[PDB]
Amino acid sequence: MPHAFKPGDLVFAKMKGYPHWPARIDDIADGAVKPPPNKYPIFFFGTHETAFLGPKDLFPYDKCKDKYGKPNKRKGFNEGLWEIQNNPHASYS
Numbered sequence: 001m002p003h004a005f006k007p008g009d010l011v012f013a014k015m016k017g018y019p020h021w022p023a024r025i026d027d028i029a030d031g032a033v034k035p036p037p038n039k040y041p042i043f044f045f046g047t048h049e050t051a052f053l054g055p056k057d058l059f060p061y062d063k064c065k066d067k068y069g070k071p072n073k074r075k076g077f078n079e080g081l082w083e084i085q086n087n088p089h090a091s092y093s
């Protein structure tokens, strides 16, 4: 049943030194910098930063929110929890 990751998919994404973080697979706009091969453009909710990650660091949101979706002290985390639950597809400019 699982497919490859696609723009709009909601995830927790893992960065070194950070808790699993609410995020989405982003689109790539025309003329924008493309990701390296086998990586995805990840938009992190709350901080609104972007990084390029491979699937080993991407966890489906609905399967893993009971484990990763509790509030955390790190800057922007609880804001990101609100975004992913309440408007995950908005433009955060």
Ligand SMILES: Brc1c[nH]nc1-c1ccncc1
Binding pocket: 014, 015, 018, 021, 044, 045, 047, 048, 049, 050, 051, 076
């Ligand atoms: Br983890 C995370 C949450 N927001 N931003 C990040 C991040 C951390 C490191 N490098 C790029 C982006």
